[PDB]
Structure 1
Amino acid sequence: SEEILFDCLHAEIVNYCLDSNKEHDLATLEYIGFTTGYRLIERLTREVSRFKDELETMKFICTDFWMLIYKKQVDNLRTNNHGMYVVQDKAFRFLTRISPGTKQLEHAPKFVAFTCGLVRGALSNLGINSTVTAEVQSIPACKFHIEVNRN
């Protein structure tokens, strides 16, 4: 399928390892990519009301995105006492290509950065408001904690 093109292209994304930036990719890839994902979202089950506010959890858009992109939803999806929260997956799609031995962790956060710094929304749990860091304790088990950029 149309997965191996992105797999290889991302392998080269990693490959250039210039000694200037820990972000081989900037959040631009993010913005444009989930902008296309938003093109996929021409319908979303959110009310039409101008007088009332209904929130679309970034968790749900994250999981649907992932099925559209990473093809395996959250295994643990925990809501932190803040407005922020954490996502935990026993396995990751890009990480299925490598054994669970902790040898080169630092690549995987650059992989999943594609969900970092996403063009936000106003309300809490509104679909796309995303500031997040990757804290991966186990090689397939990828973990990512978000932080509310405001407050």
Structure 2
Amino acid sequence: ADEALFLLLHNEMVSGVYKSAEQGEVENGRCITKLENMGFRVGQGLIERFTKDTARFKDELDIMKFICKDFWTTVFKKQIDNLRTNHQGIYVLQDNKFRLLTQYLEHASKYLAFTCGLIRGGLSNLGIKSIVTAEVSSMPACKFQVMIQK
């Protein structure tokens, strides 16, 4: 399916079904979680699909390297531009031109939530529990923070 379709679905999910009417934090939180959770499922399924070489990572840094190169390339047709880490569970994945901020953008962090899930679900299937957050650091970029859970 042309990526046009994915970009429009993503935009429609963020701006339609799962845009918060900004009633409060609870609504915002719930809308956010729905997107992120969906992303989580898609992330899982992309791994299943394109990565039944689950044996050949054999450790965290290789796994974050895979996310940065192969996984990002699967979803966004390019790699992340910078991987930084503290070597204590936190990784920051910089996308300088984040593709899902193209459909101005006030609610732009909503547009990151699905992708945070993508990464989380992708890591979940590679053996890693994480919390994944994101912010636009300097539009159109975009750092995703992966904190790995003990």
**Bin of the TM-score, shorter chain as denominator length:** 0.7 to 0.9
Q: Deviations over 1:101-144 (max 9, x none)?
A: 664432332242333542637xxxx5654321113211111111
TM-score by length of 2: 0.72
Matched residue, 2:39? 30
Distance 2:114 2:10 in 1: 8
Change (3 A) 1:78 1:128: same
Q: How many residue pairs end up in the alignment?
A: 137
Contact 1:90 1:142 in 2 (8 A): yes
TM-score by length of 1: 0.72
* Structure 2 unaligned spans of 5+: 22-26
Contact 1:60 1:127 in 2 (8 A): no
Distance 1:14 1:5 in 2: 14
Distance 1:144 1:35 in 2: 18
Task: Judge which range, 70-79 or 130-139, deviates more.
Answer: 130-139
Distance 2:33 2:87 in 1: 32
Larger radius of gyration: 1
Determine helix, strand or coil for the equivalent of 1:131: strand
Contact 2:73 2:79 in 1 (8 A): yes
Matched residue, 1:59? 64
Matched residue, 2:124? 120
Matched residue, 1:108? 111
Contact 2:128 2:148 in 1 (8 A): no
Aligned partner (choices 25, 31, 43) of residue 53 of structure 2:
43
Contact 1:132 1:145 in 2 (8 A): yes
Contact 1:115 1:130 in 2 (8 A): no
Determine helix, strand or coil for the equivalent of 1:25: helix
Q: Deviations over 1:32-53 (max 9, x none)?
A: 3123212211235618xxxxxx
Greater relative contact order (CA < 8 Å, ≥ 6 in sequence): 2
Counterparts of 1:11-30 in structure 2, within 5 Å, are: 11-16=11-16, 17-19=19-21, 20=27, 21-23=30-32, 25-30=34-39
Distance 2:127 2:80 in 1: 16
User: Of Structure 1 and Structure 2, which has the larger fraction of its residues in strand?
Assistant: 2
User: Structure 2: which amino acid aligns with 1:60?
Assistant: K
- State percent identity of aligned pairs: 34
Distance 1:71 1:79 in 2: 23
Instruction: Please identify runs of 4+ aligned residues in structure 1 that moved more than 6 A.
Output: none
User: Structure 2: which amino acid aligns with 1:42?
Assistant: K
User: Of Structure 1 and Structure 2, which has the larger fraction of its residues in helix?
Assistant: 2
